[PDB]
Amino acid sequence: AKKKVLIYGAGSAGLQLANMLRQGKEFHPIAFIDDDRKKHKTTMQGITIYRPKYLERLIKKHCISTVLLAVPSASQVQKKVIIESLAKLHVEVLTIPNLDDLVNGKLSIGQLKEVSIDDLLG
Amino acid sequence: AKKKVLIYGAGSAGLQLANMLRQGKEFHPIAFIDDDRKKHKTTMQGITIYRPKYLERLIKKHCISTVLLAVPSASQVQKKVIIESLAKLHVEVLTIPNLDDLVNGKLSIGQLKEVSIDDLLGR
């Protein structure tokens, strides 16, 4: 079976990511995490979106060892907080490309890379 | 000079739209509107982003009669909330494609459709 993941970010990029992954053979998106309270417990792309307080319980419930980060329009300060929060939970974190690479069209949303120091600091 | 608009949605979709437009000769995005208070009064590409409370004052200040929706990740319930909020400010409301039509590149972000009268009026 495909590797189960959470996608952190249920904005345009994250939803598009879930759609692509569902079709693919590598990852199965089980749910989204999103900081936007208005999306809490709403359904998009056929799965549930949750506030970040649900991170640990979902990781343990579903035995998730990988979270995909799709928050291209978040500030650097916010992205750092997110990555740090995930690091404490002992999951691998992969990220879609930076916003400029997305909007200028030189990298696909689906091009995932492991996060690095460069990603944390900015 | 191009028709002045606001773009509702300051995420990756709205940013791409603003480039579509700004390079173009039809609309000029004056500012973004975004529900995310964290983004209020931040700037992207020389355009500043405002919370929706600023809608009335921006429309009046810039004589805006058209608002473009770039919120493909909004639930239909939430999108209708947004559309009705704009209807009552006497602007025309256009929208980029739905998410699923953007992902496979079937439709371009630059294709702007008038929202339904049903959605506009909350029928």
Ligand SMILES: [Cl-]
């Ligand atoms: Cl969006």
